[PDB]
Amino acid sequence: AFIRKEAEEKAKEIQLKADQEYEIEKTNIVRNETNNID
Amino acid sequence: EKRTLIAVIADEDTTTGLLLAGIGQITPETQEKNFFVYQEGKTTKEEITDKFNHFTEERDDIAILLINQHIAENIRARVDSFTNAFPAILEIPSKDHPYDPEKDSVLKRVRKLFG
Amino acid sequence: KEAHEIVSKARKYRQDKLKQAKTDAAKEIDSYKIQKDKELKEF
Amino acid sequence: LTTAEYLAYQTERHVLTILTDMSSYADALREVSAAREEVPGRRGYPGYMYTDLSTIYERAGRVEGRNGSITQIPILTMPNDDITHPIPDLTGYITEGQIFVDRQLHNKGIYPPINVLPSLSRLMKSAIGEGMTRKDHGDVSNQLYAKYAIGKDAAAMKAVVGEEALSIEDKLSLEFLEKFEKTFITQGAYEDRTVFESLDQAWSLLRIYPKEMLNRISPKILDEFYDR
Amino acid sequence: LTTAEYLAYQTERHVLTILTDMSSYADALREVSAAREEVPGRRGYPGYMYTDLSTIYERAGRVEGRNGSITQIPILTMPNDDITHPIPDLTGYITEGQIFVDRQLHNKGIYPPINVLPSLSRLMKSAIGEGMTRKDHGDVSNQLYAKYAIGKDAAAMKAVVGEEALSIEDKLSLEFLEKFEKTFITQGAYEDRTVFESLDQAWSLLRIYPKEMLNRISPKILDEFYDRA
Amino acid sequence: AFIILDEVIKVTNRRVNAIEHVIIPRTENTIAYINSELDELDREEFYRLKK
Amino acid sequence: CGERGNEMAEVLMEFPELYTEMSGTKEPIMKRTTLVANTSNMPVAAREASIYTGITLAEYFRDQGKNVSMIADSSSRWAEALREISGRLGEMPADQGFPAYLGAKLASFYERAGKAVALGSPDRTGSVSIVAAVSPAGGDFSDPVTTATLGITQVFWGLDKKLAQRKHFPSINTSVSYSKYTNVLNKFYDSNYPEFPVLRDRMKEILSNAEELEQVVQLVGKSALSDSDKITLDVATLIKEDFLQQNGYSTYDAFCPIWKTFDMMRAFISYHDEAQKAVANGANWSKLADSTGDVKHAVSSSKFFEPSRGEKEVHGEFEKLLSTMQERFAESTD
Amino acid sequence: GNREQVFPTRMTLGLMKTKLKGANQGYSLLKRKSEALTKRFRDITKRIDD
């Protein structure tokens, strides 16, 4: 015991959060910059 | 009334008996029973802190905490870090362990200022 | 020996790359808008 | 004001005539007076500056048989923002109100930075009401003044004492003060609000309070507009 | 001063000029102004007191091709300890700095009761440095000023919220304040300290803080002199 | 009774210190400044009248 | 104008040793400066002359298609000279003994600044920028000279003595100081530094929030403050210490080119945004600050970058700073 | 020292004098409140130990 690599779970969670970031990172930034251009 | 419940963190010798004869152990619409068995060497210390948070912060009806020294010594940091008023945490002796008036948080604070 | 966790922590590296790849992607998506809004002005 | 007057009465033209930097004219009047070694008034200004500023300010108004008017908006910069300075003081005693542009509101990001508390319109009482603006215009205005004067004193008690020791009405007045200045008094340039939109927005801000503390609105008006 | 100008610029001497109680000179100037029936200035002193004082203070310095100098040290009593009084105010606009003797430090038993915050040397930025004093001097003085001001602010804060509520940085600044006032500022009436001895006392006070809290000392100076010991 | 009272006394002492060390000195300085400026204005008006 | 002879001595000593690149090659700045000195102990009546001399010279060079800046140090001394002449003339005193015509004189003098098209041919455009130091009596901005000048001028760089005594330089009072040219400059920024005004407004907002939070703290202490308020106060202190404070007598901060200023604003506002985002996502500000003190130190030390290293190099290291800050704030908050 | 940024007028002078009087008597009021609460706090700290 005490060798379980649940840091793999943390890496998977980080990747999932990095994807949901893309979501609000193309919807926030594009919206704000498009409003500025308009 | 807004807050009336009594909560007991003690071994079976206290929560089950003694005050339980007149205090009861169950809520009007809950099954939590505002108590923890705290089996000797069975209940986890992390679970003990979780139950302390449960009965001090997670639910509002609890008017007083009545906690045995057994949990309190191991839960020392958590209870010392708790500074609110409503739950009025109260340390009690249990089994053979006496009051030890140099350990519990409130009396520590009292000696800290002004004597 | 559990150093494999430190290497597996490359999710942070991927997150940084995803954020650079969203700055690049926003640069491309604002394009059509900028050319269109300047072409209305040209007209 | 002789060109404005000629259009106003001689050609019967409704005209709005503004004497920008009228406050600067006071400096020239003091320069001439000092050159003449006359007996000065406050701050060295001529003792006849009320009679010289009233021969300019009072060349506005309407007359019986002529279908023209002169509306005058002199612009006047108060030295050190002092309203007791001779120039703003004697203008206040001659003019029929003053729109007070405030530096605290301006620094606070608000435009127009008009502080309505020092401001006044002497001809508003008669210009507003039944059949000519609307029935709630005077009561709404007075209640807004009452609540703003109380929000500005709630905000001074919170600056020295904090929220925990100001009453519930004081908290309501703090809320009223934030929305008054940032949503009602704040207004973009080229944003033209109709006296009716502005009254509706005033009603939305006085609903912050309970019908019982809108004590400067009579029950008749409090009845028709408080519940819409 | 006419004597000094003779000794300094015509005889090549280096002259130190002490002008004790320029406030009494200002009082005499005000008396003459009052006899003249002149329009008095602020607090009654003449409107030309600035120019009149300039004609005194500006008689100092060095001139090209002459190996003498005049260093003035006027002594100026501030009425009611108020630095905004016309005498100190105008003197500070004419003169190249001021040494501020403070009553609060004097009461606390410190000597010399010099309060560095209201003090200035407008010619220090050029007189100090690599080839002139040591290369730490300007950074070490700026950091001392910043930490002394922070310590004053922390003492004022403690006056209200008590010592227990202060941050770690504020407590470090209080420690710095007491040690700075009672060691570096305090000196014997006959004690002379070299600027290299005083800049070694300054670094010991600045060592109360982590190197990363010395934000006004350049990183190259903080490498060479912070750990020095 | 102890917790609430300790909180209340801490707040009250902090506010007493704030009044006597921050608010009162500031108000006294403001009063002194206003008095000095009004004396200056009075001197100016008096001497202009004398002239 | 009516100022120390030593200030003119140091200009004459230093300007020959300072070089500019406006012409494309290193050349002493003294080659393109003129001095008009009327020391405080020189004849008082000449102070006015000096001012009128300076502006005229400036105007002359504006007639040649050059951009001239005329520095009047100090205009309060010219006002005092006028006051002394008026007193010798027995004229009726205006505010604080000054002549009643002082404000008109100041306004006329300041109207001589401006961007203009030269009179003759070939067509050429010049400008004269007047920068005037005002020396209010007692440090009080109620001075008549200050009151007239603030009425005339468009930029107000108001200095705080409490900052100067602390060696906080420049000691600009950010609460009172203003510029009315921020609107016309948008074009420039939109062509060169498009998000410059947004960052300027963000910095001003942070500073104002901190100023009010500090009024709260002075009486109530740094308790009952949200972690967002703690971040605001901490980052405003960071900005005041390492952005608004610039040591003009150092090899790195003697001059801060507009691009380094813009990158520093980006770094500081990025720090603020990352901290706010991290705390808003459940992070605890005290622990986060303890963990990212290194990022804080890097952001604060950003001022030590030598502008002589070039725009490209400094911008590259500022980008490295931003990326490292993002990575560390991601690491410290999971 | 530090002062409020207000314009000098006789009205403001009277306003500040009234504010100073109010500050002094409110300071005395809070002092008395603090002493009373401190006496009660002594009593509560004794009785809590008992």
F48 touches chain D (CB under 8 A): yes
H49 touches chain B (CB under 8 A): yes
SS3 G280: helix
Residues in a beta bridge with B94: B97
d(CA E22, CA E54) in angstroms, rounded, equals 12
DSSP string, B45-68: HHHHHHHHHIIIII-S-EEEEEEE
> Which residues, other chains included, contact D153 with Cβ-Cβ below 8 Å and sequence gap of 6+?
none
Nearest to G47 by CA among G86, G9, G73, G11: G73
D134 marked ligand binding residue: no
> Which residues, other chains included, contact E148 with Cβ-Cβ below 8 Å and sequence gap of 6+?
E116, E117, E176, E177, E180
> Annotated binding site for ATP: which residue ranges of E?
122
CB contact under 8 A, H8 and F38: yes
Report the gap between the CA of G97 and the closest CA in chain F (Å): 7
* Dihedral (CA of D33, D38, D44, D48) sign: negative
DSSP string, E125-172: HHHSSTTTS-TTHHHHHHHHHHHHHHHHHHHHHHHHHTGGG--HHHHH
d(CA C7, CA D150) in angstroms, rounded, equals 62
User: What residues of chain F lie within 8 A of the CB of D44, using their CB?
Assistant: 48
Instruction: Using CA atoms of E149, E150, E151, E154 in order, give the dihedral in degrees to the nearest 10.
Output: 130
CA E142 to chain centre: 13
- Best E42, E152, E160 member to test F by mutation, with max F CBs in 10 Å, is E160
Residue G156 CB-density burial (10 A; 0-12 exposed, 13-18 middle, 19+ buried): middle
G215 touches chain F (CB under 8 A): no
Amino acid in position G334: D
d(CA G48, CA G38) in angstroms, rounded, equals 9
Nearest to F3 by CA among B64, E143, D185: B64
Tokens of G208: 């104002």
The HSE-up count of residue E149 (CA atoms within 13 Å, CB side) is 17
Nearest to E122 by CA among E155, E94, E88: E94
> Which residues, other chains included, contact E63 with Cβ-Cβ below 8 Å and sequence gap of 6+?
E9
Residue E64 CB-density burial (10 A; 0-12 exposed, 13-18 middle, 19+ buried): exposed
G87 touches chain F (CB under 8 A): no
Q: Smallest Cβ distance to F22: which of E40, E44, E160?
A: E160
Technique used by the depositors: cryo-EM
Chain D neighbours (≥3 Cβ pairs under 8 A) are F, G, H
Touch between chain D and chain C: 3 or more Cβ pairs under 8 Å: no
DSSP string, G24-35: SS-EEGGGG---
d(CA G73, CA D187) in angstroms, rounded, equals 41
* Dihedral (CA of B66, B72, B77, B80) sign: positive
d(CA E61, CA E70) in angstroms, rounded, equals 5
d(CA E219, CA E226) in angstroms, rounded, equals 10
Residue D105 and residue D185 in contact, taking contact as beta carbons nearer than 8 Å: yes
Dihedral pair phi/psi, residue B91, rounded to 5° = -80, 140
d(CA E151, CA G237) in angstroms, rounded, equals 15
Residue E137 and residue E195 in contact, taking contact as beta carbons nearer than 8 Å: yes
Closest-CA residue of F relative to E34 is F47
CA D35 to chain centre: 36
> Which residues, other chains included, contact D163 with Cβ-Cβ below 8 Å and sequence gap of 6+?
D171, D174
Touch between chain D and chain F: 3 or more Cβ pairs under 8 Å: yes
Nearest to E34 by CA among B80, B55, F43, B105: F43
* Strand G67-73, strand G125-133: pairing: parallel
Residue A31 and residue C32 in contact, taking contact as beta carbons nearer than 8 Å: no
Nearest to B71 by CA among B45, B53, B97, B108: B45
SS3 H8: coil
D50-53 contact pairs (CB < 8 A, 24+): D50/D90, D50/D93, D50/D94, D53/D22, D53/D25, D53/D26, D53/D90, D53/D91, D53/D94
d(CA B110, CA H48) in angstroms, rounded, equals 9
Residues of D with a Cβ under 8 Å from any H Cβ are 80-82, 84
- Best G141, G219, G223 member to test F by mutation, with max F CBs in 10 Å, is G219
Touch between chain C and chain G: 3 or more Cβ pairs under 8 Å: yes
Amino acid in position E199: L
Residue D75 and residue D21 in contact, taking contact as beta carbons nearer than 8 Å: yes
d(CA B54, CA B77) in angstroms, rounded, equals 16
CA-CA distances (angstroms) from residue D49 to D46, D84, D192, G102, G332? 5, 15, 37, 19, 69
Nearest to G215 by CA among D181, H5, H22, H9: H5
Nearest to B84 by CA among B48, B50, B60: B60
SS3 G94: coil
* Strand G178-179, strand G155-156: pairing: antiparallel
In terms of residues, how long is chain D?
Answer: 228
d(CA G35, CA D68) in angstroms, rounded, equals 59
Nearest to G142 by CA among H3, D126, B100, A14: H3
- Best D33, D80, D84, D174 member to test G by mutation, with max G CBs in 10 Å, is D80
d(CA H22, CA H1) in angstroms, rounded, equals 21
> Which residues, other chains included, contact C7 with Cβ-Cβ below 8 Å and sequence gap of 6+?
none
SS3 D4: helix
CA-CA distances (angstroms) from residue G75 to E193, G133, G285? 42, 6, 49
Residues of F with a Cβ under 8 Å from any G Cβ are 14-15, 18, 22-23, 37, 40, 44, 47-48, 51
What is the radius of gyration, based on Cα positions, of chain F?
Answer: 21
d(CA B5, CA B65) in angstroms, rounded, equals 9
CB contact under 8 A, G93 and F51: yes
